[PDB]
Amino acid sequence: RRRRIVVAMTGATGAMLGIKVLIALRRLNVETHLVMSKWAEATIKYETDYHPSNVRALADYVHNINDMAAPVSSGSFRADGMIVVPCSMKTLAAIHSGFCDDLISRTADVMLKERRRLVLVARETPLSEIHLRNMLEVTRAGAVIFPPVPAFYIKAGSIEDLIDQSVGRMLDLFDLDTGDFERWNGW
Amino acid sequence: RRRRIVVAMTGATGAMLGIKVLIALRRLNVETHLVMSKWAEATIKYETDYHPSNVRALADYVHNINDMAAPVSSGSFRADGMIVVPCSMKTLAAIHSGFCDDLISRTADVMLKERRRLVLVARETPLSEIHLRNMLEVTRAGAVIFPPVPAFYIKAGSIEDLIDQSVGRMLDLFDLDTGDFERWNGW
Amino acid sequence: RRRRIVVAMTGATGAMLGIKVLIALRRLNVETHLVMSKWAEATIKYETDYHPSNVRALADYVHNINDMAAPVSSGSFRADGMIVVPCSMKTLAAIHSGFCDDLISRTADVMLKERRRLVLVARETPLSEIHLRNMLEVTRAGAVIFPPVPAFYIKAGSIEDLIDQSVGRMLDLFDLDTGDFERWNGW
Amino acid sequence: RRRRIVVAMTGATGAMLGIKVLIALRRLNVETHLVMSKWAEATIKYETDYHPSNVRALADYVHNINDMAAPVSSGSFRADGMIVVPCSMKTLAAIHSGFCDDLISRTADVMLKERRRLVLVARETPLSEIHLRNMLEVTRAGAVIFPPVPAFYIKAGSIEDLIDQSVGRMLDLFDLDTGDFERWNGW
Amino acid sequence: RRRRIVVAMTGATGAMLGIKVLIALRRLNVETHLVMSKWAEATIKYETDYHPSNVRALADYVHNINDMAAPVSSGSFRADGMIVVPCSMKTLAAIHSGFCDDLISRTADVMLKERRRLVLVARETPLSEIHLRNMLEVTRAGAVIFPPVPAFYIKAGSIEDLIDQSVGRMLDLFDLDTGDFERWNGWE
Amino acid sequence: RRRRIVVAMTGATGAMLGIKVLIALRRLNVETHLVMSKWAEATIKYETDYHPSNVRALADYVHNINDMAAPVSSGSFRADGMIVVPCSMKTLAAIHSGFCDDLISRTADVMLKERRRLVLVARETPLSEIHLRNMLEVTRAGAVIFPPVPAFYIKAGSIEDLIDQSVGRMLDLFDLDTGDFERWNGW
Amino acid sequence: RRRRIVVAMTGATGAMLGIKVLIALRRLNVETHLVMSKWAEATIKYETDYHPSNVRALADYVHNINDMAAPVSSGSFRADGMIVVPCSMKTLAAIHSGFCDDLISRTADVMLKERRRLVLVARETPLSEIHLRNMLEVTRAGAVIFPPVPAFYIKAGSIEDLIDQSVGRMLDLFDLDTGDFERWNGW
Amino acid sequence: RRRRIVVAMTGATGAMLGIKVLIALRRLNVETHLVMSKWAEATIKYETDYHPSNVRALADYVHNINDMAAPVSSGSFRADGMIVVPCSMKTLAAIHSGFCDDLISRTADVMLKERRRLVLVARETPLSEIHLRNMLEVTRAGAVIFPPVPAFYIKAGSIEDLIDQSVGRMLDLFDLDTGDFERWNGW
Numbered sequence A, B, C, D, F, G, H: 001r002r003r004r005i006v007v008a009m010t011g012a013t014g015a016m017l018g019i020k021v022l023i024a025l026r027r028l029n030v031e032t033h034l035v036m037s038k039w040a041e042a043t044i045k046y047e048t049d050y051h052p053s054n055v056r057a058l059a060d061y062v063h064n065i066n067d068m069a070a071p072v073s074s075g076s077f078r079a080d081g082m083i084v085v086p087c088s089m090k091t092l093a094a095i096h097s098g099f100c101d102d103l104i105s106r107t108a109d110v111m112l113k114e115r116r117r118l119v120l121v122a123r124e125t126p127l128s129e130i131h132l133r134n135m136l137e138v139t140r141a142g143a144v145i146f147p148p149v150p151a152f153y154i155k156a157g158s159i160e161d162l163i164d165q166s167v168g169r170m171l172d173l174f175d176l177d178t179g180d181f182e183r184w185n186g187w
Numbered sequence E: 001r002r003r004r005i006v007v008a009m010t011g012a013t014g015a016m017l018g019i020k021v022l023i024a025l026r027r028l029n030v031e032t033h034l035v036m037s038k039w040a041e042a043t044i045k046y047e048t049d050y051h052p053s054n055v056r057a058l059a060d061y062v063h064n065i066n067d068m069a070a071p072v073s074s075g076s077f078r079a080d081g082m083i084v085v086p087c088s089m090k091t092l093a094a095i096h097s098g099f100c101d102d103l104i105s106r107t108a109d110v111m112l113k114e115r116r117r118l119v120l121v122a123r124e125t126p127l128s129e130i131h132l133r134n135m136l137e138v139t140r141a142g143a144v145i146f147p148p149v150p151a152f153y154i155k156a157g158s159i160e161d162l163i164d165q166s167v168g169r170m171l172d173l174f175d176l177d178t179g180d181f182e183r184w185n186g187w188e
């Protein structure tokens, strides 16, 4: 019935990106399935005013990071995509290597084998050859690398305006239209 | 005598990153050599309150984008590094491919052959396999890929605070200390 | 203004190598930051007369293996080098793959992206194609593989004499001279 | 009816490893064929109390390094394996490249084409990309790389104890049990 | 306390390039360690008015090509870099393959493993796929390929002027300024 | 009925090499088709006594650098080979990449697809990994890389002697004998 | 005026192939330049009735294996091709690696760079991955691998009949027709 | 109880090699399973005095080339190895590509997956890059390439003497000793 998208958050800086993804997906009437890593919860508390319990309330369903029996861990579970936002280099490497020992990496591993859209908001700078090799080869395996670089051409008035443009551009990859930002139409 | 760094700006969004790099380098008593692409001047006018003539005044020397006889185009010219900020995918590809048909790509080509530090603030999202292949292989050739992703863990109060942290992290790669941002020291 | 070097120990045999690196680095007035793996602590207990607390007293600062918020885990933290001594195949693989899920592998991951010297005293024999592929490719990413093979040409009288020579050659890679071993100068 | 093993010594430090291999193999009733390089003889004289004449007496047969007509140089010659101990980087590269211009490299070249066990006690530190590429690719061709790294977990009392453990683990690869060292069996 | 640079000469044409490197480094108070191959000595005799004994006098220390126990053959030996000038395809291949069976190739092999600057003035034309593969892959291992192609834009009045510029550009890679050639500064 | 050879000059130093190639080819009764890049004309003026109009007078036919409709730009046009002398790194990369947006790179692109001899006098030092990758891979596509390195073994009396020898060796690749230099015949 | 072909013999079994190549080329009015390795001379003596001096008399010119100043060692020397018959794995590896430390490997190295026909009668069985890697990659560099495998379909009456057929097929690669063997034209 | 070896003959010249393999294996008390391709039967008739029915009588079991249900086509069937003698380039390519559309290529495909010894007496000269790519990559997959090149150093008196030596060296790869040829033991 309703479209399903798995939203995974990891311990890279940029926790507000994952929070605003859940808000935008809820408004778009998308059934969300949230998984938060241990260090994702730590960065949520430290960088934002949200508590992990507040972020869990923004999602239709929540699954435990270590619960490999969760419904989303099986390819038979029907879902239409997954976004890891923000995505740490550790989780990027787990997905690239195939070492799927938690629910985030396993569900991403499953999305790739089932040929479902997987978007990794990989946040790190500068990049080593390890990071770039992982990005290139996971891209060839089917994933989409979305570095959250600001779009300064929108003449933003606040940090939130840039984050809203980024979140809207992320969800474009699932053929979803937030209508929350100004798309380019020339000068 | 004074350290020399070539500062190149291209037509990717984020012109304020290159402007604040020139300001920080001037304060650090670094002799700067500025080159601006045609579309870099266009994005400076459109996203910022600066005019190209204002940015040129922030640099000790300015060289024309099409002047292949400029001093910085020769490896015999002594310089200590180059940063392309912001760096478009087009200029990243010119450097990766070796098609050095303007002063920015030629000077970058020269920095790589002379084994001088070259930093590319490559701004694009999402990334295709073309972008990532260019990033990986130019990295193996010696360049440093620095995607300008914000560091939200600093609890920034403004867009300028995030840009200042990014610029300071860029210049760390030249062993320069702005002292303009708060470095991580735990929670 | 002292030089900072991260000393990481893992659960490969040869715990005395890491202990003597700390002792050396202290005598040369280097500020050492020690991280010990869980199995490093076990190997320290089993094959040396030291206790992990004795090892911690040899370092200027100690960080917990699971504390991903430690200062050394960020590239903004300035450091001059990192040595993993001894380095197990497990940790070598974590660094090669990029699966940086503890402080040793994350700090090493940061050293590579910030282009700082990383020395892996990788101890294992014989070597599989997995080990050698990881060594070769992590070398291309910037790390130095240092197998702790004895230099019998020094005509040592004890195991400790051979360890001292190995430790001295390790620290040569950071441009540090222990002056504790006979450098080669003909027969 | 006796098993034949070619024992080759090259000019890497650690000549005692090859001497003890000859002693251990004689104990095990293996017919040994010794080949010593020119710089192996110099190394034997420098760092051991053995003269090359003493080492030749430890072997059943001795062949000249320059004698490409020696029996071991033909694949039609029955042999069960070969160990280069210690193995220099030069000889590792001769075997990797295929430039078989002396009896050691040619016999190793023959062992690989006849699909016989070839162990290279490659001793060098630190390792360059050249060394590791040669190790990885000669491994894929069928060779076993055995860095002589000490097993400190045996809680040794002398340098000789650690050499004995290494020699025993080397000969494990030929399915031989010296019985002179303590194998791991838990704490 | 002085900087040490190993200067290796091989049997590629261009022996004067190595001779002028030794002279320039002496001028810069660099302690030079010279190794000459067998065919480098033949090339010196044929192409120059120097005898190998004259070239050896230009260096602070000279090591035998066959002496694998020379000080420079160990990584424990302190040194800031090595330049092979001129560098034959044979020696380029020895370094690329790792077949380090003489003092020049072994010392270069050691420079690469110790992460020290290694410059190969590789002289050959035209180039085969063998040469180019060796150049590309040894570059990735850390070496610098410096083909001695003349910089005609200096408007030289003699062969020696072009050689002096090449030698100065070589030593730039060791952060050394001979001050004996005109660096580019736009159109004169 | 005469052989046709395209002579292309680019903005690398060494303009006299291309001028002498034209003179040598004229003496050998070869119909030459000249294309000069914009920066080739500037280098001709700067480092030689020739004017570009003098160089055009040495050729049988001259085509404009931006005229993609020139006869030599089509494979249907009969031609026996092409030499780019001197060849910049920029034009080397244009040919390697296939970005054939001027008459020199397009004609070279055509020579490769029609399996005609293409000689690139690629002049640059030192060489980066970008340059060498382009040289290796364009060689595999069919091109011949000819770095203009002097042949001191001819015991030359002037710069012109060494240039004459290089030019003669260049034209050897087209099975042409200038007879203007001394070929090697032993000591 | 006459065609020049370098004939190189190495220390693989099959010296009679090289001798019969020299006889066939003399009959075809080809100027032959012979180079014999040290182990080719030993092989000639052992498995043929020829003395090396008899083989030298079959050639128009002879050059010493260690004479790097011989005429054929330079690309400036006019020559139409080279055949190494028989070709050892050692010499195959010297050519593949580029380690051209004798006149045979240097002349072959020169033939490849000058784009002249090079035929390697590589004789070894079985083949290792080293041998096949060298064969494949030297082929891509321009060489032709000619294993001297007998053509039994000619219905030979002696060993010499099969040798004559191999020699004729070898020289087919130089566009030469010995005319002393029966080519295939159906049953 | 008895050793089983699959003997496959294909349509390359050298049918007598396959016949003599069958005779040698019968003498060695090895249970042989013969498969002949269509063009091997034509080759047997043309260059030997045997009829295909005579060759079938030399084997213990015979299977039809198109019978994909034969016992040897399954990995569950116990067998100790397989030799394809002689091996055409077509069959070499079928095994390399995996296009196992007859019993010879499928049985070889099975031998590789079950990790059993597979020897390909690949006969062709000269070799293309296609042939050598197939040889190299099928070798890495487990097969042994055995070019039937004669060993002239045995000082043979007839064609059959050289064939007997090749056959004995072939079966050396199955740890079998025909004992009817002189192995090398010096001059």
Ligand SMILES: Cc1cc2nc3c(=O)[nH]c(=O)nc-3n(C[C@H](O)[C@H](O)[C@H](O)COP(=O)(O)O)c2cc1C
Binding pocket: A009, A010, A011, A012, A013, A037, A038, A039, A040, A043, A087, A088, A089, A090, A091, A123, A124, B153, C068, C069, C100, C101, C102, C106
């Ligand atoms: C405050 C803080 C910020 C961090 N930011 C990043 C980051 O931007 N990128 C990254 O790759 N890792 C970052 N890390 C490190 C990761 O949290 C660490 O590698 C962790 O093991 C990743 O775990 P996870 O992917 O399972 O959530 C940060 C850590 C902390 C404590």
Ligand SMILES: Cc1cc2nc3c(=O)[nH]c(=O)nc-3n(C[C@H](O)[C@H](O)[C@H](O)COP(=O)(O)O)c2cc1C
Binding pocket: A153, B009, B010, B011, B012, B013, B037, B038, B039, B040, B043, B087, B088, B089, B090, B091, B123, B124
């Ligand atoms: C307003 C604007 C913003 C742009 N932002 C980017 C960008 O973020 N990344 C990118 O690769 N190209 C961007 N482009 C496109 C580049 O300007 C374009 O590819 C141009 O050819 C690059 O030229 P240059 O690198 O020589 O300056 C942008 C263009 C415009 C007009």
Ligand SMILES: Cc1cc2nc3c(=O)[nH]c(=O)nc-3n(C[C@H](O)[C@H](O)[C@H](O)COP(=O)(O)O)c2cc1C
Binding pocket: C009, C010, C011, C012, C013, C037, C038, C039, C040, C043, C046, C087, C088, C089, C090, C091, C123, C124, D153
């Ligand atoms: C006594 C002992 C000795 C060990 N020696 C080695 C070794 O030499 N090399 C290795 O790769 N692993 C060795 N291991 C196994 C590692 O401890 C194990 O793989 C562990 O997962 C490594 O974890 P760490 O790198 O986080 O310390 C040893 C284990 C024990 C108990």
Ligand SMILES: Cc1cc2nc3c(=O)[nH]c(=O)nc-3n(C[C@H](O)[C@H](O)[C@H](O)COP(=O)(O)O)c2cc1C
Binding pocket: C153, D009, D010, D011, D012, D013, D037, D038, D039, D040, D043, D046, D087, D088, D089, D090, D091, D123, D124, E068, E069, E100, E101, E102, E106
């Ligand atoms: C005293 C001494 C110790 C050496 N130790 C090593 C070593 O440990 N590893 C290495 O690759 N080369 C070492 N070498 C250099 C080799 O001996 C040199 O490369 C030589 O050419 C190897 O030749 P071979 O393999 O034929 O014996 C050493 C040389 C000397 C004089």
Ligand SMILES: Cc1cc2nc3c(=O)[nH]c(=O)nc-3n(C[C@H](O)[C@H](O)[C@H](O)COP(=O)(O)O)c2cc1C
Binding pocket: E009, E010, E011, E012, E013, E037, E038, E039, E040, E043, E046, E087, E088, E089, E090, E091, E123, E124, F153, G068, G069, G100, G101, G102, G106
């Ligand atoms: C006069 C002369 C000039 C030579 N020039 C070159 C050259 O320019 N490039 C090259 O690769 N080899 C050249 N050689 C060949 C090398 O000397 C030969 O390959 C030798 O084996 C190299 O040995 P080395 O590198 O140890 O000195 C030349 C030889 C001679 C006699």
Ligand SMILES: Cc1cc2nc3c(=O)[nH]c(=O)nc-3n(C[C@H](O)[C@H](O)[C@H](O)COP(=O)(O)O)c2cc1C
Binding pocket: B068, B069, B100, B101, B102, B106, E153, F009, F010, F011, F012, F013, F037, F038, F039, F040, F043, F046, F087, F088, F089, F090, F091, F123, F124
């Ligand atoms: C005086 C001068 C000398 C130059 N020499 C070289 C050179 O030797 N090699 C090179 O790659 N570029 C050299 N360049 C830079 C090229 O001219 C520049 O990259 C240009 O874009 C090449 O354009 P073209 O290949 O279309 O002629 C030189 C430039 C100048 C002004």
Ligand SMILES: Cc1cc2nc3c(=O)[nH]c(=O)nc-3n(C[C@H](O)[C@H](O)[C@H](O)COP(=O)(O)O)c2cc1C
Binding pocket: D068, D069, D100, D101, D102, D106, G009, G010, G011, G012, G013, G037, G038, G039, G040, G043, G087, G088, G089, G090, G091, G123, G124, H153
């Ligand atoms: C009698 C005899 C036969 C040989 N046959 C071969 C052979 O068929 N293939 C091979 O690669 N090496 C063979 N060799 C070994 C080579 O002679 C040896 O590797 C030598 O180093 C090659 O040197 P060269 O290529 O410079 O002549 C044989 C050696 C001897 C003594």
Ligand SMILES: Cc1cc2nc3c(=O)[nH]c(=O)nc-3n(C[C@H](O)[C@H](O)[C@H](O)COP(=O)(O)O)c2cc1C
Binding pocket: G153, H009, H010, H011, H012, H013, H037, H038, H039, H040, H043, H087, H088, H089, H090, H091, H123, H124
């Ligand atoms: C008389 C004759 C001799 C042949 N010799 C060879 C040969 O030596 N090598 C080869 O690859 N093909 C040779 N062929 C071609 C093969 O028979 C042909 O490619 C066939 O398709 C192979 O089929 P098979 O491998 O299934 O037997 C020969 C063909 C004929 C008629």
Ligand code: DMA
Binding pocket: A068, A069, A070, A073, A074, A075, A076, A110
């Ligand atoms: C947790 C669980 C039962 C996973 C199995 O589903 P899958 O994605 O591995 O595919 P399949 O339905 O074939 O088992």
Ligand code: DMA
Binding pocket: B068, B069, B070, B073, B074, B075, B076, B110, E151, E153, E169, E184, F013, F124, F125, F126
């Ligand atoms: C613009 C110009 C004259 C470039 C030449 O310098 P380079 O970097 O190509 O090196 P070199 O000094 O050897 O010519």
Ligand code: DMA
Binding pocket: A124, A125, A126, B150, B151, B153, B169, B184, C068, C069, C070, C073, C074, C075, C076, C110
């Ligand atoms: C604990 C912590 C702050 C980790 C992030 O380090 P970083 O190097 O990724 O920081 P940045 O790239 O934003 O400078």
Ligand code: DMA
Binding pocket: D068, D069, D070, D073, D074, D075, D076, D110, G124, G125, G126, H150, H151, H153, H169, H184
């Ligand atoms: C001394 C000698 C005979 C060397 C050739 O060995 P080989 O393995 O090539 O012999 P063959 O392949 O002929 O059995």
Ligand code: DMA
Binding pocket: C150, C151, C153, C169, C184, D124, D125, D126, E068, E069, E070, E073, E074, E075, E076, E110
């Ligand atoms: C001549 C000689 C003794 C060389 C050893 O140098 P090395 O670098 O291989 O030894 P180590 O690594 O122990 O310093």
Ligand code: DMA
Binding pocket: F068, F069, F070, F073, F074, F075, F076
């Ligand atoms: C100026 C022009 C006609 C270019 C097309 O040449 P082409 O070789 O691509 O065309 P064709 O394949 O028909 O020769």
Ligand code: DMA
Binding pocket: E124, E125, E126, F150, F151, F153, F169, F184, G068, G069, G070, G073, G074, G075, G076, G110
């Ligand atoms: C003995 C000798 C002169 C060797 C040089 O040959 P080469 O082909 O390398 O010289 P060049 O490239 O100048 O023609």
Ligand code: DMA
Binding pocket: H068, H069, H070, H073, H074, H075, H076, H110
């Ligand atoms: C004719 C037949 C039964 C073929 C199956 O062989 P297999 O080795 O593919 O079967 P399995 O894997 O079940 O042993």
